[PDB]
Amino acid sequence: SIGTTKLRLVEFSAFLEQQRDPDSYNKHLFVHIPLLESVDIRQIYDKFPEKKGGLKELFGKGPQNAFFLVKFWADLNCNIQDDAGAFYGVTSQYESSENMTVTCSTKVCSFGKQVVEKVETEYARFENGRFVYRINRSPMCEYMINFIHKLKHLPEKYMMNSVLENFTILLVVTNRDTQETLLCMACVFEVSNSEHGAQHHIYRLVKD
Numbered sequence: 001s002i003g004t005t006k007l008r009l010v011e012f013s014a015f016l017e018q019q020r021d022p023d024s025y026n027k028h029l030f031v032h033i034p035l036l037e038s039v040d041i042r043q044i045y046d047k048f049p050e051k052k053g054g055l056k057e058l059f060g061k062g063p064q065n066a067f068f069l070v071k072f073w074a075d076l077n078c079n080i081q082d083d084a085g086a087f088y089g090v091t092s093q094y095e096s097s098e099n100m101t102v103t104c105s106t107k108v109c110s111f112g113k114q115v116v117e118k119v120e121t122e123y124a125r126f127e128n129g130r131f132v133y134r135i136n137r138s139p140m141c142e143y144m145i146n147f148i149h150k151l152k153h154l155p156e157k158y159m160m161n162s163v164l165e166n167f168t169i170l171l172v173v174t175n176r177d178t179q180e181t182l183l184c185m186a187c188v189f190e191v192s193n194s195e196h197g198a199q200h201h202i203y204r205l206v207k208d
């Protein structure tokens with residue numbers, strides 16, 4: 001799932017950690033993570049950067065099989081109250097057969113222009129016969145937290161899906177030493193209506 005032979009995505013969790021007292025805590029998940037359906041990559045070009053270093057140039061440069069598309073169904077049903085000890089975090093994990101230095105570039109884009117870019121570099125750890133790259137408790141950007149607050153204030157869910165059409169996040173995982181594309185996840189977001197659930201669909205990007 002969401003992976004090639006050279007790199008595999010194990011877990012992708014974006015959460016909100018809350019504590020009202022040491023007696024009772026709670027971590028609420030916004031999004032959580034063998035043949036993939038095919039989606040034309042040209043359909044999502046406008047939503048992601050088209051300039052140098054954009055999704056289009058990356059496709060030509062990098063391997064075609066490494067690119068994917070994810071439709072996240074985000075769970076926005078959570079009580080947002082006092083600041084207290086609240087933490088917005090993204091925990092990711094990648095496991096790979098080969099040893100390398102991995103760079104995780106998270107670009108949160110609005111209206112097809114990158115607003116905030118988070119570049120992180122992780123070193124290899126040998127665990128259970130493979131190399132596991134774990135990015136633990138990435139503190140969420142102040143932009144993204146204020147963004148989530150902007151969503152929850154919206155009265156009707158149908159409105160949220162409308163603004164989120166312009167909200168995209170392009171994960172690009174790269175080998176630092178070789179400058180080779182290892183994995184790429186174009187993510188689009190929609191709200192899922194449920195008492196407590198999160199859904200996600202994964203597609204493979206192709207040019208045809």
Ligand SMILES: *CCC(=O)Nc1ccc(C)c(Oc2ccc(Cl)cc2)c1
Pocket residue numbers: 014030031074090106108116118138139140141142144148169189
């Ligand atoms: C600001 C850094 C960051 O990691 N932002 C980020 C990237 C990806 C994902 C999936 C995040 O989690 C959410 C995105 C969108 C919504 Cl509506 C909810 C959570 C956050």
